Amino acid sequence: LGSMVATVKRTIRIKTQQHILPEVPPVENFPVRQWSIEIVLLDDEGKEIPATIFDKVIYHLHPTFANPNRTFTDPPFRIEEQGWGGFPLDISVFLLEKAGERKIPHDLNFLQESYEVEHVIQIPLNKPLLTEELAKSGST
């Protein structure tokens, strides 16, 4: 375990919603949908709170999107787009104080109108400002 001993775990929740845009012509008879993704943090009780432990989130979209790497700096880091197909994507989340990048695997899909996915990430405890922020969401 070594250096990994000096971390805490937190659960983040990725929230996705999508709906068809009828005013947009289907692509090969596939409807174009508006979709959104946001990110929240869970506390030790499972309540959603702002994910302020990240100072940046970058969505790395399918290369069929114009400038597919979309950067957000303010919680809940909400991205909105239009598209005709689902796809796996990586979400890069950057911890405060350059504590590290985490890549979170997401799948953007049209199986439900809205769906939530939880991911556990390990966060270091060596950056004072990040450690203070972490206290808001649970034990450290």
Binding site: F30, H62, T64, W84, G85, F87, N109, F110, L111
Partner: peptide
């Protein structure tokens, strides 16, 4: 579609 997917 609900199963519409793109190739990677």
């Amino acid at each position: 579609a609900q199963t519409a997917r793109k190739s990677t």
